[PDB]
Each structure stands twice: as structure tokens, then as C-alpha cells.
Amino acid sequence: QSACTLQSETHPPLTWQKCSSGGTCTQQTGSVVIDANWRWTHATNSSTNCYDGNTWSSTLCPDNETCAKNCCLDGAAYASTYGVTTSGNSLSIGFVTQSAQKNVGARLYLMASDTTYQEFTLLGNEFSFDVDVSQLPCGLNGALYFVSMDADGGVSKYPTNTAGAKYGTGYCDSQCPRDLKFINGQANVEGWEPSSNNANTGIGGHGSCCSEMDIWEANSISEALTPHPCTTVGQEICEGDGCGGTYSDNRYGGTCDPDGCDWNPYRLGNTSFYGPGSSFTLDTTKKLTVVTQFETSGAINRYYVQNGVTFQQPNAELGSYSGNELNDDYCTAEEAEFGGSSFSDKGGLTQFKKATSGGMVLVMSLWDDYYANMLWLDSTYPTNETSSTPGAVRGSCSTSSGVPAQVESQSPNAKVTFSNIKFGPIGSTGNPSG
Numbered sequence: 001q002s003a004c005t006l007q008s009e010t011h012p013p014l015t016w017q018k019c020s021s022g023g024t025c026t027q028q029t030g031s032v033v034i035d036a037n038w039r040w041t042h043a044t045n046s047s048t049n050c051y052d053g054n055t056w057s058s059t060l061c062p063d064n065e066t067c068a069k070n071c072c073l074d075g076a077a078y079a080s081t082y083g084v085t086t087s088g089n090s091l092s093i094g095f096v097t098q099s100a101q102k103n104v105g106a107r108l109y110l111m112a113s114d115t116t117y118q119e120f121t122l123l124g125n126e127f128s129f130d131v132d133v134s135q136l137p138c139g140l141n142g143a144l145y146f147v148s149m150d151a152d153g154g155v156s157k158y159p160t161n162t163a164g165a166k167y168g169t170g171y172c173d174s175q176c177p178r179d180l181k182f183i184n185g186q187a188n189v190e191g192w193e194p195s196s197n198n199a200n201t202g203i204g205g206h207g208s209c210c211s212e213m214d215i216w217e218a219n220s221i222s223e224a225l226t227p228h229p230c231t232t233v234g235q236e237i238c239e240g241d242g243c244g245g246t247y248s249d250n251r252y253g254g255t256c257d258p259d260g261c262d263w264n265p266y267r268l269g270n271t272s273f274y275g276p277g278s279s280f281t282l283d284t285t286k287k288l289t290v291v292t293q294f295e296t297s298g299a300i301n302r303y304y305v306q307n308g309v310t311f312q313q314p315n316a317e318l319g320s321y322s323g324n325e326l327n328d329d330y331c332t333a334e335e336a337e338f339g340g341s342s343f344s345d346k347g348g349l350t351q352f353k354k355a356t357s358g359g360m361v362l363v364m365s366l367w368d369d370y371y372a373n374m375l376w377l378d379s380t381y382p383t384n385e386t387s388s389t390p391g392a393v394r395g396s397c398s399t400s401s402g403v404p405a406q407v408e409s410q411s412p413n414a415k416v417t418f419s420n421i422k423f424g425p426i427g428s429t430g431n432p433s434g
């Protein structure tokens, strides 16, 4: 696609900190951009939509190449249309925002400049942030994660995409998502089928795969930390049922691991660590700090801070594994106790190091789950298992929570607020800011 300026594109600002082993932290100026899919797509020369509800214009947009020549992405009104505001080092994202239409959720990327995403090399370093999940009920997911996207959004490889990172192009993740309207400089109309349960989406014939590190998927009830390796580390288009991922016949038939090796403390047996109120170690009615370290072995360490007290990730006994680090040993024990081989099939933590040792782009989003209602995160899943099944129970939510029309209409003011991002060498992010 190309870019149109009927609505100007101005990225909300957001400050973060770059920390140093020398004891100091230095303020960086970034901005956030919304993903291209949320944007208005219309004709280059006019105002006729190329896309509406969940179908494409037969006239403007009869194939993938032509439709890219005829269509463009416009600017976005972050606050009034998409419920996205920033203030200082803080970013809020609202759930349902009513304007001319009803917008649900947002996915945003941190930017280095007007035209380029900020690339973070995770391996050897740590990422810290603060989050308020108090306004996230059952069924929602305020996510902060990284993906192996190209810094320029695809522009230098696919010259039919002149819009680029400024308009949020280039997304990929380990689900090899096929709901994207534009992939690799072309549209995704060759093959489209509308969603039945969703007025606004559908599934195209192409998907966009890459490595994904889910630092934080959470609401007020449950949280999880999950790396997802792929056989090909960075962004890469896939075709149809062979994409794999959530909406293909065989979830496991693609290049990426859609399950991951997740660590959810409640799932592992600690039902009093994370939750609403002061009967939980971490009280999700209040702001908390989350620190994540990418050890050079490929292991991942986690600790939290709330109201000045530091808590390490809780210990887990899981098969033969005992500890509190997401390593090799834990991943292997998880497969053996909870089932699965997707994670080690696609290379395990070793293959995941190739992602973390190159650049990854920071993503922050809020979403609801048209496929499984977020039950995999905060409830019993699958829905007909009971706690005598290992790892079935992931949170205390009811088995009928999370249906998207339900929560869209009963908690439209849900919001997530992320703030105070700090990034630098291991052990540096507890340094004072400045």
C-alpha cells in the first residue's frame, strides 16, 4: 500500500530509559504507531473504501497487486478513534471507544523515528516496565511483547509498500496471522473469507510469520510469560492451511510454534501469588513492576516489584524440574507433564536465542479473543477438564467468561496502562532515571 494524508499521522510521544552498567539511566524519546490493520484503507485518488466491515471492493481491489496500486492507508486519530493516550513515560490503551464507528482494542509499536521501529537486542539485557491491570476483567489481555519485524516496515524489500513503519506495516508473529490486510507490499484479498463471529475481520490467503517473545500477557486474574521459536527467525510470508497457527486446520503444520513454553504461576500450582486484593502476594488492584532478563544461556529470569518489596518468580515443581527460571529443563518438563512438542520441534530456547540475539520490535496491545475467549490464560482449558488434569487450570475465571460480544458490552471502559519502560544490561534497570 501507499500512504494518504486526508488524516495526518502523528505518533503519540512516549519516553523510556536506556540503562547502563555504569550506574546511570538516560532518557530516550520515542513514539508509538498503530498497526496498519486498524487504519482506514481507501482509494489513492478518492474516498471510496477499499475495505468495509469484512469485505473488499470488487472494483478497486480485484487481486493482491492491483489493490496495492489502488489503495492507501490513512492517518489515525489515536485518542478519539482508538482510545490510545500517552503521558510522559506512560501509555494507556482503552478497550471499546465509540466515535463514528465502534473500535475494539489496538496494537501499537514503539518507534525510533518517524520512519523506523526501535529494535531491541534482548539477549544479555533486561526489560523493565510498570503496568496497571486493575481495569482488566476476565476475558481481556493487555499484552507487551516483542516480534522479529523489519525496522522499516518492509519498505526496502517490497517497493509496492511505500507507507512503511510510519503506518504500522510489517507485523508478524508466531501465530502466522492471516487476518492482516497487507503483507509484503500486497493486499490479502486473493483468498479472503469473512469472520462469522466478527463484523470487522476475516482471514486471507497469506500470513506473516516470525519469532515472538511474550513478556507479559495478563489481566487482573492471571499472567503469563511465553517464548515462541520459529524455524525462520524473522518476518516471512506463508500460504493458507500451511501457515499453521490459530486459524489453520493443523495449528502445528507451519514454521512457528503457536503454543510456546509458557510460565503462568497459577497454572504451575501457585494460586495465591497474583490476583485482586491483599490476599495475593502481588495485588492486581495496584500498579506493579515487572522485570525480565534474557540470560546469555537462553534462559529467562523474572522478578516483580510492588510498593518497594521485591519478589522473585515463584518456585515450581513440574515433573523433574524444580526452580524458578524458564530454561531448557523447564520447557522440556512442561511438554512431558502438560503435553505438546511444538516448542522443541521448532528448536526450543536455542532457536529462540537467534531471535533474541538479533533485533526485535516492542509491541503493546489490548485485545479480546474471538477463538478461545482468553480461557487458556485465566480459566480452565480446555473447558471440560478439571483440576485433576495437569495444567488445565490457569486462573479462577469461569468457564463461560470472555465471550467477546459479552465483555465488549459489559466492560467497555476496561483499560491497560503500561509505563516506565527501562531497558539495558542485566542488573542495570534498578538504576535511578534521568
Ligand SMILES: OC[C@H]1O[C@@H](O[C@H]2[C@H](O)[C@@H](O)[C@H](O)O[C@@H]2CO)[C@H](O)[C@@H](O)[C@@H]1O
Pocket: 226, 246, 258, 259, 260, 262, 371, 372, 376, 377, 381, 382
Ligand atoms: O491459540 C490461542 C492461544 O493458545 C495458547 O496456547 C495454549 C493452547 O491454546 C492450548 O492448546 C494449550 O493447552 O495451552 C496453551 C498455553 O496456554 C498460546 O500460548 C497463546 O499465545 C495463543 O494465543
Ligand SMILES: *[C@@H]1O[C@H](CO)[C@@H](O)[C@H](O)[C@H]1NC(C)=O
Pocket: 269, 270, 271, 272, 273, 281, 313, 314, 315
Ligand atoms: C506462592 O508464592 C509465594 C511467593 O513466592 C510463596 O511464599 C508461597 O509459599 C507460594 N505458595 C505455594 C502454594 O507454592
Ligand SMILES: *[C@@H]1O[C@H](CO)[C@@H](O)[C@H](O)[C@H]1NC(C)=O
Pocket: 384, 385, 386
Ligand atoms: C474433556 O474432553 C476432551 C474432549 O476432547 C477429552 O479428551 C478429555 O478427556 C475430557 N476430560 C474429562 C475429565 O472429561
Ligand SMILES: [Sm+3]
Pocket: 236, 237, 238, 239
Ligand atoms: Sm514461506
Ligand SMILES: [Sm+3]
Pocket: 295, 299, 301, 325
Ligand atoms: Sm539465572
Ligand SMILES: [Sm+3]
Pocket: 328, 329
Ligand atoms: Sm539442562
Ligand SMILES: [Sm+3]
Pocket: 319, 337
Ligand atoms: Sm506427572
Ligand SMILES: [Sm+3]
Pocket: 341, 344, 345
Ligand atoms: Sm519432534
